[PDB]
Amino acid sequence: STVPELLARQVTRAPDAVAVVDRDRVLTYRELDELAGRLSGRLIGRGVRRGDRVAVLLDRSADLVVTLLAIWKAGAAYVPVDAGYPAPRVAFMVADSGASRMVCSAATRDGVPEGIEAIVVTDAFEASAAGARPGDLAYVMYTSGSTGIPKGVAVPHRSVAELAGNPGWAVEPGDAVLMHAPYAFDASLFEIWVPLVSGGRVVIAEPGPVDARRLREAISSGVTRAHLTAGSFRAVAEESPESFAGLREVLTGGDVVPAHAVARVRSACPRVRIRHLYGPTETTLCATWHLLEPGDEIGPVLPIGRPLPGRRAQVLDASLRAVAPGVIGDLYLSGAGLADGYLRRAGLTAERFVADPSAPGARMYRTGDLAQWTADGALLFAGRADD
C-alpha cells in the first residue's frame, strides 16, 4: 500500500471532515487532496519525475502537509530539511540525496542552496498526479545515530503505509493529533500520516516548543492524542503530570524513559492511555511498543514492549542463535517497515540490513542495542552495545 492510497479511502468516505487545523486555517480532507493535486501539477510542470527526491524547507503549517502529499502525488520522495539547520548541513542533505529542487516559503527562501531550483509554496497550476507506488521511495530522512556522521535512510511507500495504517494505533475519525515534531524526524509519521489515514485531524502546534501549559491549552481545544520526546515527557511527568489529563493517549519514545515518569502520569491521570514507542529511523518510526491501559500501573521497569502488528524481533547471541528469556543479547528487527537502505551506501546497507535466518529471503535490521525477552514475549532494553 501507500499512504496516499489509504488517505484516498478517507477522502471518499468523509470528504468534508476536518483534516488539518492551522491557527484559523482549516482544511477538510477534500480540500487537502485538491490543494496537493494542484501543487503536484505544479511540480510535474517544473519537471519533477517519478523517483526524484524533492527537498522541503518549511515551518510547520498546513502548507507543509500539502507539500509532502503533493511530492508524493508527483511520484517523488521528499527530503525533509529543518529550516533551522546550518547552511552546510542543508547543502549536504540536498546534494547527498540527489535533490535538484526544493519547496520553500517566502520566509525560508534564503535557505535554498545555490544551484537548487526554489519552488515557493506561497506563490496557479492545473491538478495532475503521477500517483504514489509502494516500491517507490517516500522519503529520505537523515540520521547520524551514535556515530555523528549523517546518512540518508531511504524509506519506501510500502513501509510508511505499514506504519501509518497499523491497526494498533487505534486512531479514529474523532481524534485530533497535535503536530509539533520536526518533519525531518519520523515521529512526524504519527503526528501527520496516522490521523490522516484514520479519518482524524492534524492540529498544527503554535510556533515554539510544546510545554505543559501549551499542552493543556491544546487539550482544551480538542486535541486527543499527543507524542512527546522522552526528554519532554520526563520533564512534564515530573513537574506537572496532571497536564496530560483529558488526553485519550499520550505517547513517548526516542531516548530512555524511566518507569517512574510513567507512574507519575498514571497517578495524576488514571484514565489516560500511555504508550512507549521504540525503534530506529531504519525501520520507520517504531518497531516495538508498550501500552499502559487506563487504571493499570507500570511495574519497576518500562518495557520497550512487543513488536507492532506485522513486525518481529529477535534477540541473538554472538553466534546468531536465539537466546532464551532473561538472557541479554543483540536486538534485530524484522517484518514490516524496513527501509530500503542508506542512500548511495550499499556496503553500509549490507552490513546492517542483514539476512533473516527465520524468514525466507527476508532481511532484519541490526539495531546495535541489547535487549532481553520477558517470559510472555515483551522486550526489555539493556543499553546500547557501544555504550
Partner: protein
C-alpha cells in the same frame, strides 16, 4: 563484539531474490532464500564487492 562488526572474521556476501545484498559471517548457516555470491573473504573485501555490484537498492 557483534559478529557483523568483527574485522578479523571470515565473511560471505549473500543475495536474495530481490537483488538485495547482505554480509554474512561464514560460520553461520546461510538463511533460506539467500545465495552466497562472494567469499569466504575478509570483511572489507565483502564490503567492496557489495559497493561495486549492488548499484540500486530498490528490490527487484
Amino acid at each position: 563484539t557483534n559478529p557483523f562488526d568483527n574485522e578479523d572474521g571470515s565473511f560471505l556476501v549473500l543475495v536474495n531474490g530481490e537483488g538485495q545484498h547482505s554480509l554474512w559471517p561464514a560460520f553461520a548457516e546461510v538463511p533460506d532464500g539467500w545465495t552466497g555470491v562472494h567469499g569466504p573473504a575478509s570483511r572489507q573485501d565483502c564490503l567492496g564487492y557489495v559497493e561495486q555490484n549492488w548499484t540500486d537498492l530498490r528490490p527487484k
